[PDB]
């Protein structure tokens, strides 16, 4: 739901895998368990928790308070029923569905948000219900269930983009677009950060900037950064919050690897132990390394091992297997030679290869017109 | 009304009286004329609907449409109940 139980119950990832940080997460998880009817979530995740000595103490009170508030919402629903009104029943069934999202059961909340989803007099409250399924779909990390109601609720809006509704839907686009590895189309989503604000429902503003600084810092090149973020005053405002981000932006844009590799361990450790950002930690590292190697290797034709080793601050034995793996595996530039122990590339990728970029579509189109020949007579 | 009704003595005609919108007829038209624009979650439609008297339901449309301009002038994200009270004072001065 929109309560802080989404984040407190969202720390279960760092509560589960590492055993070092599993103390504060169970501290504010057990302390916050008396809030927002957290019984069923932590009872489901009880295998990753402590023993049953103190566990069975509060279950008897939470299981009876759940039935008490549940039967009070049922009596209020029966009082709202059999009466002339539309928003009253939507508020009763919607509040019941919000409590069923507090307990963390999407069966009665699925049929509840289905009933109040069918009682939507307007499309705005319908999109509000869709968002009510997205706020719990983030915790449930479902793929299609959160894209179906947004695919159906996306078209036929006709009421214009609000300041927090359409912007909130764009924030959700940042969420599921950060889950997926799509970057070249997700680089346009965070451009509306001027109208964004502190949203305690899903993600704080500083967490939204901290999450978009990876897709913006890695998924964008130097002209894209200079056009979007360097020209924009938003990162100039939010860089004063943490001095590290300014180092990872001015050091990367300044091409200083001696400090970027010394400080990159904070990006390595901070990159993991996250709910939605951990399983992609392997792609950001390699993609950022090959992006920096293409950045430095773009303006440089030949490169000696002395200036390279002093520039990157690492031994030659490691960059040997680095470029050796990035010739075939990386596929960034032409073949490299070591006849003089000097990185020397040619890169004839403009004159003839600029015309040869269409031969792939010519061969695939050739197989497609061979399929067109297969359609003939049958 | 007296001339047309003088020519229409209720022979074949549906007589439905059109009254001025009552309280509930101000809550529902306030919601129909409030979904189109922004609205906070800490506003009570009961009292703000009871504080919109005057001619008819177009006075509520004067509060909303003549309140979005104060949302523009104030340069805020949404419209608060105090802005709606200001528009109430404006439409009650225009009344």
């Amino acid at each position: 739901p929109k309560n802080p139980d989404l984040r407190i119950a969202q720390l279960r990832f760092l509560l589960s895998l590492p055993e070092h940080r599993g103390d504060a997460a169970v501290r504010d998880e057990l302390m916050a368990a008396v809030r927002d009817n957290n019984m069923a979530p932590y009872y489901e995740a009880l295998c990753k928790s402590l023993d049953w000595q103190i566990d069975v103490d509060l279950l008897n009170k939470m299981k009876k308070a759940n039935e008490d508030e549940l039967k009070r919402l049922d009596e209020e629903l029966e009082d709202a029923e059999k009466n002339l009104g539309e928003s009253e029943i939507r508020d009763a069934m919607m509040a019941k569905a919000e409590y069923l999202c507090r307990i963390g059961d999407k069966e009665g909340a699925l049929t509840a948000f289905r009933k109040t989803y069918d009682k939507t007099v307007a499309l705005g409250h319908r999109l509000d219900i869709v968002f009510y399924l997205l706020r719990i779909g983030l915790f449930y990390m479902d793929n299609d269930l959160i894209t179906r109601n947004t695919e159906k609720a996306k078209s036929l809006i006709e009421e214009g983009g609000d300041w927090d509704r359409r912007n909130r839907l764009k924030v959700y686009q940042g969420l599921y677009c950060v889950a997926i590895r799509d970057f070249k189309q997700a680089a346009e989503l965070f451009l509306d950060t001027v109208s964004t604000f502190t949203s305690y429902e899903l993600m704080d503003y500083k967490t939204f900037v901290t999450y978009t600084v990876y897709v913006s810092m890695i998924a964008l090149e130097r002209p894209d950064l200079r056009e979007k973020v360097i020209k924009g005053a938003e990162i100039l405002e939010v860089l004063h919050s943490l001095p590290a981000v300014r180092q990872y932006l001015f050091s990367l844009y300044e091409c200083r690897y001696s400090v970027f590799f010394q400080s990159l361990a904070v990006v390595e450790q901070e990159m993991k132990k996250d709910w939605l950002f951990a399983p992609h930690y392997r792609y950001y590292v390699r993609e950022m390394r090959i992006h920096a190697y293409s950045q430095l290797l773009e303006s440089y034709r030949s490169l000696t091992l002395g200036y390279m080793a002093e520039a990157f601050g690492v031994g030659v034995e490691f960059i040997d297997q680095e470029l050796s793996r990035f010739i075939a595996a990386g596929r960034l530039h032409c073949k490299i030679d070591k006849v003089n122990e000097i990185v020397e590339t040619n890169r004839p990728d403009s004159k003839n290869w600029q015309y040869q970029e269409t031969i792939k579509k010519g061969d695939l189109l050739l197989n497609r017109v061979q399929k067109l020949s297969r359609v003939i007579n049958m | 009304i007296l001339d047309s009704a003088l020519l229409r003595p209720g022979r074949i005609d549906r007589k439905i009286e059109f009254p001025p919108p009552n309280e509930e007829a101000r809550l529902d038209i306030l919601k129909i004329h409030s979904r189109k624009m922004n609205l906070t979650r800490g506003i009570n439609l009961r009292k703000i609907a009871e504080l919109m008297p005057g001619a008819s339901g177009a006075e509520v449309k004067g509060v909303c449409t003549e309140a979005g301009m104060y949302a523009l002038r104030e340069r805020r994200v949404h419209v608060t109940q105090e802005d709606f009270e200001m528009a109430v004072a404006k439409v009650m001065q225009k009344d």
């Binding site: 214009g160 300041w163 | 189109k36 449409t65 979005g68 301009m69 523009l72 002038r73």
Partner: peptide, 28 residues
């Protein structure tokens, strides 16, 4: 091939003119 007219034309005319899609983001 006064200040009533200057204020009304001011906020009703030049304020919507200096913004794009403002019609869309004012509750048209």
């Amino acid at each position: 091939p006064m200040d009533i007219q200057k204020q009304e034309v001011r906020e009703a005319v030049e304020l919507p003119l200096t913004h794009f899609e403002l019609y869309k983001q004012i509750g048209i």
